[PDB]
Amino acid sequence: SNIPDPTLPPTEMMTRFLHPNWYALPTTVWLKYGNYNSWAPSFNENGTVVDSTTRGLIWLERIGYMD
């Protein structure tokens, strides 16, 4: 048969396996309008899973307090 010998690499199954429970859902965009443009739409949340404030709280907990 064409089946190779069981000692020939590769020998692992889930080397490039990705479960849907980690698929990088869509979130807010956080645009940036110059430096003195404060009356400007900061976010772009059209097809997001979670709203802006919750995304910001996630960022604060995980990244903003990493130091």
Binding site: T48, V49, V50
Partner: protein, 139 residues
């Protein structure tokens, strides 16, 4: 013990651990079969077993001790001469078809994982998966 048994701080890795959710922020867990050393060792063991199986003789009949009731007359054929030969062949061939089983297993696993959010209720019904599946279909 007497006081509060949690003592949350501003680390979020000790805070998450103290409340149970410790591995729940890593992508995939840590396993043993992911290193090339253990793979080389397992392959060595398998090759040794296959070597030992192939160094067996072909004429490998078995006397079954129940052939007494079968009054064999030196011309009849014992109905159990091939029982250790069959087991040796089964084990050898199963050891030689390992990669085929691995391939079919990984095909099954991939084709059942890709449809998690569509076939598993408590995953399909969370507000986040529903929101994502809606977000994909935005015309």
């Amino acid at each position: 013990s007497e006081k509060k048994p949690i003592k949350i701080s501003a680390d979020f890795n000790a805070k998450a651990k103290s409340l149970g959710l410790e591995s729940k922020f890593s992508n995939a867990t840590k396993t043993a079969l992911g290193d090339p050393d253990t793979e080389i060792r397992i392959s060595a063991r398998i090759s040794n077993r296959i070597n030992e199986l192939e160094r067996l003789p072909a004429n490998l009949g078995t006397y079954s001790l129940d052939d007494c009731l079968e009054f064999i007359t030196k011309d009849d054929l014992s109905s159990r001469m091939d029982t250790f030969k069959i087991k040796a062949l089964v084990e050898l061939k199963s050891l030689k078809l390992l990669t085929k089983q691995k391939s079919i297993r990984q095909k099954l696993i991939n084709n059942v994982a890709s449809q998690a959010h569509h076939n598993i209720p408590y995953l399909r019904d969370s507000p986040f998966t529903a929101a994502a599946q809606r977000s994909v279909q935005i015309r």
